[PDB]
C-alpha cells in the first residue's frame, strides 16, 4: 500500500531532496534511480518497477517563482525523484493565490502519481512552516487533499521557523497554516530550527553550515522514523497503523521528537531510553506533562531487555506522566539497514505528545498580537487585503490557534474531564 511526497516550499524541497538522497543511501537504489549495483526488502510502497529500470518514486517537485528546485534537478540524483513534473511573494495569501492559479494544473500530476499505486495509502509533506510561497500553499494543499482523498492519511513533516526573532511576516504566515494543520492534516511532526541548531552545535562544531547542514539532521530523523514502514515486521508495516496512539485526539497531534546519538563519530536499552528522555536530545525547546510516547530503535536488542527497561524507567520516574487517565510508552524493536553503513548500535528515536510545544505556539500567538497593533507586514499588497475584507479569516485563525493553546494547557491539567 503506497505513499506519495508532495514536497513543497523551497526548504521543504531541500529537506525532501536530502531525504531522498539519504534513502538512496539507505536503500539499494542508485543516485540515477536505477537499482543499485550492490542489489529481504520492500521498495513497493515508494518506488516504481519496470524494464525501463529507473525505479522513479512518487515525487512531485512543486516550485513557485522558482530557483532551488532546478538546482536540485541538475544533479546526478535527478533521475531518481523525477516523474517529470516541475512547473510554475513570501506572504501567506500570495502563496495561497499562487497555489490557486495552478491548483488543478498540479493536481493532474498529484492524481497521476496517486495512480503510481496498486492501492494508495497517504500523502507526506516535507515542509517549512510560514515559509514563503509554501506559506499559503501548504494550507492550500491541506484544504484540497482533505476533500479530494479523505480516507488517506496526510502527515506534515514541518520545520518551524526559529531564527531568534528570512521571513519576518512569520506570525501571519504561520498562523493560518497552523489553523489548517489543526483541522485538515491528520498528524504534524514539528521540528524547531533553534533546537536543531542546538544539535548542530552539540554533535560537532558543524553549526557553520547549519542553514544547509540542518537538511542532514532531519534526514536521519526521517529515515529512522520510516525504518519500520520500509521493511517486513510484526506491526507498523502500515502507515496509519504507525500513528494511531501518538494521536490521542484530533486536536492534539503536533508531535515532538528526540534522537539517540546526536553524535557517535556497549550501549543498551536502559541507557537509550534514559538518553531519549533528555531535553538536550528533544528537538523542541507552570507545569508540563507528557501524553503518549513512541520510541523506535534499530539494533540487535530483543524484548527481554525492554520489558525490564520500562519498569526501570518507571521506578526511576523519568516517566513523569499519568495526567488524567492511562497514558503510555511504546516498544521499539526494528532492523538495522543491510548493505549500507550502520553507525551506533541502538541508534533510535522518540516521537511524543507533551505540552511544551504550546509555549512556542503561544510565542507565535504573542508575536501575532504584537504585530496586530502595527500591521506593517500587510505591506499594502492587494491580495493580502482582498482575500480577508473584514480580516475575518485571520480573526477566525486567531481563535482557532488560541483554542489550540487552550487545548494543550487543558491537556496539561485534569481539565480534560471537560473539553479543551
Amino acid at each position: 500500500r503506497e505513499i506519495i511526497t508532495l514536497q513543497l516550499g523551497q526548504c521543504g524541497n531541500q529537506i525532501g531532496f536530502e531525504f531522498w538522497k539519504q534513502l538512496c543511501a539507505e536503500h539499494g537504489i542508485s543516485p540515477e534511480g536505477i537499482v543499485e549495483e550492490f542489489a529481504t526488502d520492500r521498495k513497493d510502497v515508494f518506488f516504481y518497477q519496470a524494464d525501463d529500470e529507473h525505479y522513479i518514486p512518487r515525487a512531485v517537485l512543486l516550485d513557485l517563482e522558482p530557483r532551488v528546485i532546478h538546482s536540485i534537478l541538475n544533479s546526478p540524483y535527478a533521475k531518481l525523484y523525477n516523474p517529470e513534473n516541475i512547473y510554475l511573494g513570501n506572504n501567506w495569501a500570495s502563496g495561497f493565490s499562487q497555489g490557486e492559479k495552478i491548483h488543478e494544473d498540479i493536481f493532474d500530476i498529484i492524481d497521476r502519481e496517486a495512480d503510481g499505486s496498486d492501492s494508495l495509502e497517504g500523502f507526506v509533506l516535507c515542509h517549512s512552516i510560514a515559509g514563503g510561497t509554501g506559506s499559503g500553499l501548504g494550507s492550500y494543499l491541506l484544504e484540497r487533499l482533505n476533500d479530494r482523498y479523505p480516507k488517506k492519511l496526510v502527515q506534515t513533516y514541518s520545520v518551524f521557523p526559529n531564527q531568534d526573532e528570512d521571513v519576518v511576516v512569520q506570525p501571519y504566515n504561520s498562523l493560518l497554516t497552523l489553523k489548517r494543520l489543526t483541522q485538515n492534516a491528520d498528524c504534524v511532526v514539528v521540528l524547531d530550527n533553534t533546537a536543531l541548531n542546538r544539535i548542530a552545535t552539540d554533535r560537532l562544531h558543524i553549526q557553520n553550515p547549519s542553514f544547509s547542514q540542518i537538511n542532514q539532521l532531519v534526514s536521519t530523523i526521517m529515515s529512522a522514523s520510516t525504518t519500520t514502514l520500509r521493511y517486513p515486521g510484526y506491526m507498523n508495516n502500515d502507515l496509519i497503523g504507525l500513528i494511531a496512539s501518538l494521536i490521542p485526539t484530533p486536536r492534539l497531534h503536533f508531535l515532538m521528537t528526540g534522537y539517540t546519538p546526536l553524535t557517535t563519530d556497549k550501549t543498551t536499552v536502559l541507557d537509550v531510553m534514559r538518553r531519549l528522555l533528555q531535553p538536550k536530545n528533544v528537538m523542541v525547546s507552570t507545569n508540563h506533562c507528557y501524553i503518549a510516547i513512541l520510541n523506535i530503535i534499530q539494533g540487535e536488542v530483543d524484548p527481554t531487555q525492554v520489558h525490564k527497561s520500562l519498569q526501570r524507567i518507571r521506578e526511576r520516574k523519568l516517566a513523569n506522566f499519568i495526567p488524567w487517565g492511562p497514558a503510555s510508552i511504546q516498544v521499539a524493536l526494528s532492523r538495522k539497514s543491510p548493505y549500507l553503513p550502520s553507525a551506533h548500535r541502538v541508534s533510535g528515536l522518540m516521537m511524543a505528545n507533551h505540552t511544551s510545544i504550546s509555549s512556542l505556539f503561544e510565542r507565535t500567538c504573542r508575536q501575532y498580537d504584537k504585530l496586530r497593533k502595527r500591521e506593517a507586514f500587510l505591506e499594502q499588497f492587494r491580495k493580502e487585503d482582498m482575500f480577508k475584507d473584514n480580516f475575518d479569516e485571520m480573526d477566525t485563525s486567531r481563535e482557532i490557534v488560541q483554542q489550540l493553546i487552550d487545548e494543550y494547557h487543558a491537556a496539561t491539567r485534569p481539565d480534560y474531564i471537560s473539553w479543551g
Binding site: 515486521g233 506491526m235 508495516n237 497503523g241 494511531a244 480534560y416 471537560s418
Partner: protein, 349 residues
C-alpha cells in the same frame, strides 16, 4: 519413532518381553544411532573390542569398549542433522513456519489483513471459502514458494470477534517427523489468537460529549497496544528468537524433536491457551470484543451516536481492568505466575 528401525515400544518391556543388562548403559545410543542410519540410507565391532582388550575391573574394561559406539553414534547423527540442513534445508523450513505464515506480520500478513477485513460492508463475505485462499495470493514478499491453504473459512462465539479459519501448510515426509500434524494443531492457535489481537487493534486503528469518544479510545489503545506488544514481542518474538539459536545444538532426531515439542508447549502456556481459560482468557476475550463493539458504534465521522449504554460499556471496561490486575495478582498465590506478573505491569491509570 515409526520410521522404525525398532520396536523399542514393546521389545524393551518389563513383563511380556525381556531386556539384556550389559547393553542398557548404551542401549539408548544404539537405538537412536540405528534409527539415524536406517533413515539416512534412504537419502568389525566384534574386532575393535578385541584389539582394545588386548592392550581386574571388568566394569572398566567394558567402559573402554563403549567409545566405539559413542564415536559411531556421534558420527552418524552428526552426518544426519547436517544432511537435513541442506537436503531439506531445515532451518529455512522452520523459519518459514513463522515468517511468511502462522506468526510474523511480515510483508505478507498485512497485505492480507487489508483485504478480507475491508468495509464496503465486508469485502464480500468472510464465509466464502474461495475468496480467502485467492486473496492470500500475492504472498510474494522476499520469496513466493507458498504451499498453504487459508482453509475452513468458518468451519462452524457471541463477540464481534468471531471464530474459524483452521489454517494448514504443506509439509513433506522428510520433515513430517519433526513438524508433526499435532504440532500444527497447536501452531494454529497462536496464529488465530494473534489475528484476533491484530484485528481488534486494527479496528481502533482505522477510524478518524464529543471528547468522550476520544477518551474511551485512548483508554482502549493503552490496553490493546500494550497487550498486543506483549503478544507480538513479549510472547511471539521472544520464543521465536530463542528457538532460532538452540536448534543448532540439538544434534539428533530425538533431540531436535524434543526441543521443538517443549517450545510449543511453552507457547501454549505463556500465551495461556491452556486449561486456565476461565480466569484470564474469558476476561481478555471480552475486552478484545468491547473494542470491536466500540469500533462499530463510533462510525469514525458522523457524530450521531446518542445512546448511553456504551458509557456503561465504558464502565464495563473499567471493571474489566480490575478483573485484569486483581486476577493477575491473584496468581502469586498459585499458578503459572512469573510471565503473568510481567503482563500485570500494565500501568493501570
Amino acid at each position: 519413532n515409526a520410521s522404525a528401525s525398532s520396536g523399542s515400544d514393546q521389545g524393551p518391556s518389563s513383563r511380556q518381553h525381556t531386556m539384556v543388562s550389559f547393553l542398557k548403559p548404551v542401549l539408548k545410543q544404539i537405538i537412536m544411532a540405528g534409527k539415524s542410519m536406517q533413515l539416512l540410507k534412504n537419502l568389525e565391532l566384534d574386532d575393535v573390542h578385541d584389539p582394545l582388550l588386548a592392550i581386574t575391573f571388568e566394569l572398566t574394561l567394558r567402559s573402554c569398549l563403549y567409545p566405539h559406539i559413542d564415536k559411531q553414534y556421534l558420527d552418524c547423527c552428526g552426518n544426519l542433522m547436517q544432511t537435513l540442513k541442506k537436503d531439506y534445508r531445515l532451518v529455512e523450513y522452520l523459519q518459514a513456519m513463522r515468517n511468511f505464515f502462522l506468526m510474523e506480520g511480515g510483508d505478507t500478513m498485512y497485505d492480507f489483513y487489508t483485504s478480507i477485513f475491508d468495509k464496503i460492508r465486508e469485502k464480500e463475505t468472510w464465509q466464502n471459502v474461495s475468496f480467502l485462499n485467492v486473496q492470500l495470493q500475492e504472498a510474494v514478499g522476499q520469496r513466493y514458494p507458498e504451499d498453504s491453504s487459508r482453509l475452513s473459512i468458518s468451519f462452524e462465539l457471541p463477540v464481534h470477534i468471531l471464530d474459524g479459519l483452521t489454517l494448514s501448510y504443506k509439509v513433506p515426509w522428510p520433515v513430517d517427523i519433526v513438524i508433526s500434524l499435532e504440532c500444527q494443531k497447536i501452531y494454529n492457535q497462536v496464529f488465530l489468537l494473534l489475528l484476533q489481537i491484530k484485528w481488534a487493534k486494527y479496528s481502533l486503528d482505522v477510524l478518524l460529549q464529543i471528547h468522550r469518544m476520544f477518551l474511551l479510545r485512548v483508554k482502549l489503545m493503552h490496553f490493546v497496544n500494550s497487550l498486543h506488544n506483549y503478544i507480538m514481542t513479549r510472547i511471539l518474538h521472544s520464543t521465536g528468537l530463542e528457538f532460532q539459536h538452540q536448534v543448532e545444538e540439538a544434534k539428533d532426531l530425538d533431540q531436535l524433536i524434543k526441543i521443538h515439542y517443549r517450545y510449543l508447549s511453552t507457547i501454549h502456556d505463556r500465551c495461556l491457551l491452556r486449561e486456565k481459560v476461565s480466569f484470564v482468557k474469558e476476561a481478555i476475550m471480552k475486552v478484545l470484543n468491547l473494542a470491536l463493539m466500540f469500533a462499530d458504534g463510533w462510525q469514525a465521522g458522523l457524530g450521531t451516536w446518542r445512546m448511553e449504554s456504551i458509557e456503561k460499556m465504558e464502565s464495563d471496561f473499567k471493571n474489566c481492568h480490575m478483573f485484569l490486575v486483581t486476577i493477575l495478582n491473584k496468581a502469586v498465590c498459585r499458578g503459572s505466575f512469573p510471565h503473568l506478573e510481567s503482563l500485570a505491569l500494565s500501568l493501570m491509570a
